[model samples]
Target chain A: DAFKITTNAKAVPGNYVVEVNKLAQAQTLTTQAKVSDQGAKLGAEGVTDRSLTITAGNPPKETKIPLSDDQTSLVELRDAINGAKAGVTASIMRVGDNDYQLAVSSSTTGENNKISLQVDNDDQLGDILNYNATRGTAMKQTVAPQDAELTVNGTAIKRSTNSISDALQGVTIDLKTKTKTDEPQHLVI
Target chain B: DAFKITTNAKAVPGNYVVEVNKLAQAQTLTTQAKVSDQGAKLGAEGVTDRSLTITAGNPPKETKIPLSDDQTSLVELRDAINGAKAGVTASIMRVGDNDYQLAVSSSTTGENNKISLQVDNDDQLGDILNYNATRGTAMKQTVAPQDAELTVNGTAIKRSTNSISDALQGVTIDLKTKTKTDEPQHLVI
Candidate 1:
């Protein structure tokens, strides 16, 4: 065999064990407006008083990001949203050569994680950025923040992050995705 | 504060801790032969007989790889050595546009892990590959497999691999390089 090994006695003899704990997750959301390829060319006639609010975490913290005169292009808007550090991160996804969309995701995951948009004066920038005061007009909920559900040795557990080590003895199990069935995954030491 | 947290009363909370353990290490060694850009142009006339031997682990397992007609070119030779899976791996490093060198590394890490070469019938191939049976003729020891030495919680430990997880509780310490001083490095959990 190409990968055969011939070992005498084990160099360091010990038992390796792994146990599953709660898994971590993040909230992912998307905007309804298609991003423009030419980010610098986007702007209206007057100063737009628009803001985007991302609601997440306990008591549902809302971060209000103000969009003033200078921020018009898609790149500039993305930078402004990221600079705000508003419990969420922003990015642009290109679906076609010229067609792109705005993506916003929560920094953490759990229940009560939501993202919404609001606009006051000029609705042009809000319309382009996919956010308006009107309900269901700008952004759409893609994925909600859900806690990781798993069990360790018949003991049920839940966590906000996927990498968990508290329930295990000298081991950490990384949760990739939710299991399809109720049957617990077994781990042998 | 802008980064203030407004938690209700009750939320799931936990504390995490980490501990240090023995570090892992690998034995790396290089070759002295300067590789030529034109791999296919290597070798003179007749079938050449050459072989490389890599020794490692207990029981002193030896893997002998035969070099025949098809393994004349430098690339072909490298592929054959890798395909053999002889307790070692082979690679070519490009030092110059036309000058390259063959690098052989032990598959496992330990004090006795070593790689040596022997050539017969075709010394030209050996000369180009930088391996000769005649003393002081070809090749030199670039590196040797030394055990990884490090202190864990003020206690010293040694291991063969750079990634070690056995000695600690839910932790794997990676040994980057040998420490220069005896001063113990503290790992705060």
Candidate 2:
């Protein structure tokens, strides 16, 4: 997981100035810890069916998780996100002895994988699930999706993932730590 | 020059399916043969100092050729284009006994290098130099700037030039002829 280089048979033996400016990470978000427990209903009294749509990625894809009357609990919503085969993971986090919140995380690491949510209908569900990184409102963003940025011989490059392969000739670099600008690392093939 | 394969030291020994749907070409265009001779003044009555501007390329750059009163001939205009250090070549062609036309060609091969011209003020110069590929009037395009299109293992790829290097791992492919889709050639690296 640390600084590692993977080269195919085609990689030529040479020296490269490898400098990792930043690393990529998945965005993690959490709903309000207002629910008393995992089984507590997350919707209004009369509310039943609500759709929580998650949009993400550069080629932005929308995944709508339909919620029914029985599925209004924090645990049920977390399981629904996982069961829908969404490109994200959800889990109930017990903030306190009685309060629990649903933590939703993007599966892939990239700036484009930043999470945004939309809950159709249900005032309670909207207050809990309708979260967007742009507003930074109701829900709390535990982690922000970050894209990898690095420089090869001073030429700055940005990649969606930590595994960089396209810059150098036949060299794939797995970035672990950001290289200090004053003390650049030498990647010898 | 045609269907040449250049492999580097890092290229692994393997076979590749190469298919060139089309080849890249530089755009060649010619103005109307309205000028009786190459030395004839190509301007209206009392028309002089008209500027002819040429624009082209992806990062579009504009080159303005200043035409003086004495530099209103076809040969002079051709020399101005060359002297302006534009990314295109201009020359006078003898179409008939007394008919001469200015031929302009893009230096590089690519769809982005398509040539376009604009003449400010002079109607005569505008009639002769206000040529655009979109209009296709007052000038004839002998060769349209074409971007190279090919496929490697059924994956479609495009290149601005005939020489390609970034696609394959360590192989540089130089396209000469368009390979028929039904009969793709084999590139053994």
Candidate 3:
């Protein structure tokens, strides 16, 4: 829709300035699982089946993954976790030719988008994928997601996401970092 | 193009890990100028012409701008500066009703992409647009872009930009901030 208003007036002359002290950014959280070589190898005779459950938020979602004897390899386990649609993604990080690790990350950014994993059964797979709760396995948290915080015209503002369009009129401030020093970032207009 | 390699030996298994302590980034520099209202108005009589010169790094290009009497408005002056392709861009910020200021930024990022401005002539235009040099004008240095510094696997690294793909083998680390405390950021691969 297009609308127009017409007015005849001379603009009063004045000088104005705007100074930006900070940028907005999205929060991120990371979880990591260590890779081990001495395990019940895939297709092994005595390898037992395993299961894992994942929970993630805002509206909270739960996903379950089942591991068979044939899916005991590190890469295969990672692939199974990724295919579960668990509101998170999985990646295999190769630190060495023979060494590998599983890194999981939330699909969305924000404090409410945290991820938690649980080992449903006591198996070799449980020792590898269970990192959040102390039920049967140990998983480590590598990084935590942080909400976006900033100031506009000396007023404090906080948001779950970094791309904020509602804080300032007709202006979208993408926050990059929190001000570390006393020098307040000035956005004069 | 596609290629395949065949090996006869079984792959050796071992444990490996990579800890990322730092990330790479490029340098940035920022300059701020104050806006004032008490000056000759746009298209006003007795207004004289003016010029501006800018020098920036890497083969160091020089750009000159001509300010006519009609380009005395803050917005007009910013448009002129941006149109010149002088290694920088200009913007008009509204701090208040009838209050406006001119903001300038570099066209490129990195240590070698620093910007310097010089007012070539004297006039009411000179007092408004001359923000860099000291021919008879004063501008303030709000922020200076420093080189990105970080540690990777205990090895120190530095770069001019934040997106780094070469420091680590098959890994690209996007730096967000300098390590402020003794607790270095650990990225285990």
lDDT of each: 0.53, 0.74, 0.51
Give the alpha carbon lDDT tens digit for every residue of B14-47 in model 3. 1112223333322222223344551325433453
- How does model 1 score on DockQ? 0.01
TM-score for each of the candidates = 0.40, 0.48, 0.44
Weakest ten-residue segment in model 1 chain A by summed lDDT: A1-10
Interface RMSD of each: 20.2, 22.4, 10.9
Give the TM-score (vs. native) of candidate 2: 0.48
Candidate scoring better on DockQ of 2 and 3: 3
Candidate 3's DockQ is 0.02
Off by over 4 Å in 3: A1-49, A133-137, B1-189
Total clashes for model 3: 23
| RMSD per model, one decimal | 19.1, 19.0, 19.1
lDDT of 1 at A38: 32
Per-residue accuracy of model 2 over A1-189 as CA lDDT, tens digit each: 236887888888877776777777667777754777678776776655678898765677898877886788987887688787667767554433565666776777788877788988776678778887454337877665778888887789999887888877778887766665586687677
**Candidate 3, position B94, lDDT:** 68
**Which 10 residues in a row give candidate 2 chain A its minimum summed lDDT?**
A91-100
Q: Could you tell me the lDDT of residue B96 within candidate 1?
A: 81
Off by over 4 Å in 2: A1-189, B45-48, B133-137
lDDT of 2 at B176: 81
Worst lDDT 10-window in candidate 1 chain B: B11-20
